[PDB]
Design a protein around this ligand. Sequence first.
Ligand SMILES: Cc1cc(=O)oc2cc(OS(=O)(=O)O)ccc12
Ligand SMILES: Cc1cc(=O)oc2cc(OS(=O)(=O)O)ccc12
Lengths: 564, 564
Amino acid sequence: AGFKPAPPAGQLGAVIVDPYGNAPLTALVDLDSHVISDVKVTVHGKGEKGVEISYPVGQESLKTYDGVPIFGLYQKFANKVTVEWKENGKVMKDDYVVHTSAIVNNYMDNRSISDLQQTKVIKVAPGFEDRLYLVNTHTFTAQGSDLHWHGEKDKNAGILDAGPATGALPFDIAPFTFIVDTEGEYRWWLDQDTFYDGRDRDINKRGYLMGIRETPRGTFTAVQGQHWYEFDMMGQVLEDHKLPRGFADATHESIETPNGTVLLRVGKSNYRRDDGVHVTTIRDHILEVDKSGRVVDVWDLTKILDPKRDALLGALDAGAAHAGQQAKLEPDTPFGDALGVGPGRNWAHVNSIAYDAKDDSIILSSRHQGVVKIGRDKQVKWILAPSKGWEKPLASKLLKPVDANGKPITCNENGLCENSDFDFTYTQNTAWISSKGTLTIFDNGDGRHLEQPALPTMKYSRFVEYKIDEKKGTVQQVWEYGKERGYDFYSPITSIIEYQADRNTMFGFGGSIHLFDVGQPTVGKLNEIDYKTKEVKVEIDVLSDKPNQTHYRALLVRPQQMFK
Amino acid sequence: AGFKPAPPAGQLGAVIVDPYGNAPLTALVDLDSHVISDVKVTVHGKGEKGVEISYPVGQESLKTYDGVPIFGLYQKFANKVTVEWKENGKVMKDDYVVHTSAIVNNYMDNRSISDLQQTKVIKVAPGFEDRLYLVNTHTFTAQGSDLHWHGEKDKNAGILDAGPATGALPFDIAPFTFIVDTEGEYRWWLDQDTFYDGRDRDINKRGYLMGIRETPRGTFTAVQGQHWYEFDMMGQVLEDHKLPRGFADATHESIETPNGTVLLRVGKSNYRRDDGVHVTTIRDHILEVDKSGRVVDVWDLTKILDPKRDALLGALDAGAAHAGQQAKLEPDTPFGDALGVGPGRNWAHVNSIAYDAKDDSIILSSRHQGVVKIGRDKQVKWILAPSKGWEKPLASKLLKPVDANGKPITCNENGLCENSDFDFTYTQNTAWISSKGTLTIFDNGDGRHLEQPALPTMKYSRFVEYKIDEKKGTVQQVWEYGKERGYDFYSPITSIIEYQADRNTMFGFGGSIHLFDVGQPTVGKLNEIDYKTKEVKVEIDVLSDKPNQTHYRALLVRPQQMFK
Ligand SMILES: Cc1cc(=O)oc2cc(OS(=O)(=O)O)ccc12
Ligand SMILES: Cc1cc(=O)oc2cc(OS(=O)(=O)O)ccc12
């Protein structure tokens, strides 16, 4: 007799390209029963200025893969790779030439500019040549939203009518997942078929790939639709879980805790309203699940917050077609993925979670309400949002702005402060806990100060950081950036920042720059901003393969951790 | 329009039969947005002597299920069920008539006696009426073993010949998994199609469903073919993990540890022998994986033990056909699931794992070598086995028998002792650590004292318990049973015992009594022996649905623990 396997490439086994079949720019050196240790891989850069990628490989990984993991390959290229190890106390080395094949975009139509998304390197300081960024983005399907949850007909419903829709099953799009180096090169591709099939009508293979977050094992969590996953940089799918039967539409975030639980953002399916109508609620529930997929805890935001507060909601850009125009709420808006008040409408739009291990409490970003900390006791602990709209007892949880001296800062109910840089955040994203123990937010900025400005381009996003005295109920703004970069730095939606303590930078990714330039690719701008000087250390730009097709997130990933 | 969902049965949601589709004798009371605590359920007995099943339901479980788990229903019956909870400080109670459908055996041919396995209640002392036992048995497929792993041609192989076979892929049988009460009634069924498909050639759905072991959550882990799983009593598949690419043929055991990991018994695929032929090894590797499915550690027993020790290998029954006859080892036995020496043959047949938390070590049952403790450091710690055949440095590990006084006991190299009731174990099973801390074993008894006896019926199985002093290297046999019951209590293969501290019994199951009685159903014997008095508290017989078809194990399951 039959066909033999690949024969050994060097002093170990065969060198297999894309072993798990989901990551075509990876490869594996088969152990072939060799007992090695002290392993190190080096993928050599392409061209004169190509980037080298180098990393150690720990014993768990050798055992898991039964071989040496090769991450960092270029596509359709005779990659040169070097593996060093120790075998029998002798230092060993092999050099491999590893051909790869092509990256494929399986979702293309007449909107397609070309098959892959374009990179434009803009700025790369000295000492930042090694950086790698994983880009969480997507590409439109030819058919667009084609499926709906079926809901419950309301008493307002016509008699001959068919039942309605509910939840957000249309929140569904092809993934575009890759790592880019500082030369604008693809160094990693997650096969679109790994989790998604938009040609099939298998809802298990549908949704919006999101909330990709590293774990303590050097791996990543993710959510797509009605499932949550774990996977590594070799393209191995480590977990695949259906959501617990009460729940639906997991989007935006998934982060692992120190306790080995995972926090998910979902909705509640067949949620019984007070008027006795059932709906799939919209982005207003939080799950804590274990690695069995079981439900450790649940946070029902419809009973913690105020689903009737429309302070920010009514002040929104409809475009996020009818772009620019401020959002006019109506009382009879049908339930579903729509701007509105109450359960079964998009009242909350939680888009980010952070676990606070010090006090066993989650921190949350509600695009449409503000930022909050809720205890394990399901009690709100503090709020960070403009005073407008809130009633008690919530109103008393609002934080109070103060300066570096601790003296209060005077702002109105719309968030407009006086004689200060201090400002809140609006339609914000990733409200996380920096390594510093502070809170980093990406203040997208739509509906800032609870109004639309005289002109669409008058808008702007910030990186911004806050110091919060939970004891005193005060909040100090301690760092911002981007307020002065204009509409070319304004992302209305998605996006992220993250403090990088290793090089004292503030990482960021603006995911929808120029979303509203009808007919132009959308811009995903990768940034590392110097924390001390605000010097731009890295700037790189991703451009959508279709016009007006937003990006979601990016991560700063480190090979030294990818393979424990 | 459209079809409405089931309407509420009582004061909560609808009542769903077999919510997950894998456990037809279960139901779920949908929560319907009610917030309830203090939940307890009672499934009333059928007929006069019918056994009632009563249990608490924990929050996590209500949350996981979004409803109350109903377990313990009779097949095709109008089950009367009582659910009791608290809601708004007020006591609540509902009574439900839950109709159920039929249990199906999907694997029937002309060997079939009837479709389901028959039960015979023999003894049930008072105060033991409530017991439930999960029976882990199996039923022949029409085609039998139809698949093989492909191996590597050895140097003696004919030049024109096709490549050989390897590993143990033909270890393949449909499951028969049910819970039985002391009235002989089935009170739970795990749908055969849950893990197995024997008509389809998807090797992902093949194997031998075994090693069902409770977890710290009251769920169960289990292995079949090339995957390992976790499920619960509602039939929810909590985990489904492919084996790590290095390994194959998971059988016999899977046990979770206090550290979240899971121990598995596997073989090695593409194991490069010293002679450089690649084989899949047979039942001689131990994995420690985590719930991401990654290899945390591994024991290659072909380097830890003596794969050439044949003292027991040569003294075994061929029937385990050519039954009764003693096994005659040929050096040229083709690599595979065949009795013999070396990597690639069944030199070890490990069939139990115990984790010793006290020192981070594992205890293993090797059917063909004995019982050994290996350390985290991969060093053998002690061996419990007859002394014949062991070379240094292994022989110096053997435990030395002693009486109740610590006086040495005299045994010859074959395990046969003088003037004491102490005996060794032979082709044994489930060497686990009792709640007392002691070592319980199912001494199957084949090849006892390293020979076949004069007459075939001259065989017997023991329940047996040992106390070990590791510091001193001495083992004391401290409890036994089954020695007097003869060949009618003899199980040549499989089987299990576990000490039950709660009613001070020794639980036992004999999976293969009368296996060789040609034309006769094989007897699986559920036994509870009073520990102090050696009185039979429970004894129930399970008869195979085809002649000459072994059972594997049973578990004493507690509903009070099923839904935490
Ligand atoms: C895909 C998409 C289209 C759109 O027009 O509005 C969005 C708003 C979003 O908010 S966020 O989840 O807070 O980033 C996310 C994604 C979208
Ligand atoms: C099905 C079967 C037939 C047989 O004759 O030998 C076995 C040995 C087995 O391992 S053990 O449980 O450790 O004995 C398991 C199953 C079988």
